[PDB]
Amino acid sequence: SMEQVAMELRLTELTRLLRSVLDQLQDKDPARIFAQPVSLKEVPDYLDHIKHPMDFATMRKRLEAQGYKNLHEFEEDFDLIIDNCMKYNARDTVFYRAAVRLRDQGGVVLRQARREVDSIG
Ligand code: NA
Numbered sequence: 001s002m003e004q005v006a007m008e009l010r011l012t013e014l015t016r017l018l019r020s021v022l023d024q025l026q027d028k029d030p031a032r033i034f035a036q037p038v039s040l041k042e043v044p045d046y047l048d049h050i051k052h053p054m055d056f057a058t059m060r061k062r063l064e065a066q067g068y069k070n071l072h073e074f075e076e077d078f079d080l081i082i083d084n085c086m087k088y089n090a091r092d093t094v095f096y097r098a099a100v101r102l103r104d105q106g107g108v109v110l111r112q113a114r115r116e117v118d119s120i121g
Contacts, residue, residue, distance in 0.1 A: 015066050018074050021113045026056050028105040033098045034081050049088050054080035071117050075110060
């Protein structure tokens with residue numbers, strides 16, 4: 001059906017916008033602290049602590065499968081990256097501080113993305 005096609009084209013355009021958002025967020029992490037999963041071979045107890053690990057590579061895989069149906073889903077995954085880091089790492093660490101800074105800087109990017117998704121439909 002043509003209605004199915006139109007929904008597919010909308011998902012594709014959202015995916016395109018979310019790619020640009022993901023690139024912009026990742027630019028705010030030049031140290032690449034959040035680029036890849038935590039290795040369970042190097043914080044071996046990680047999964048006793050953190051139930052839903054998340055990272056930018058994992059988000060990118062979901063995005064390339066058009067796996068985010070709306071901006072809220074994408075934001076939830078970004079917030080997991082931040083939130084997991086602020087739980088596992090103490091307030092005095094470079095990791096926790098990097099999460100705070102990414103949150104602050106990412107807020108700006110996400111604020112405009114919400115306006116563009118609403119505005120374009
Ligand atoms: Na903590």
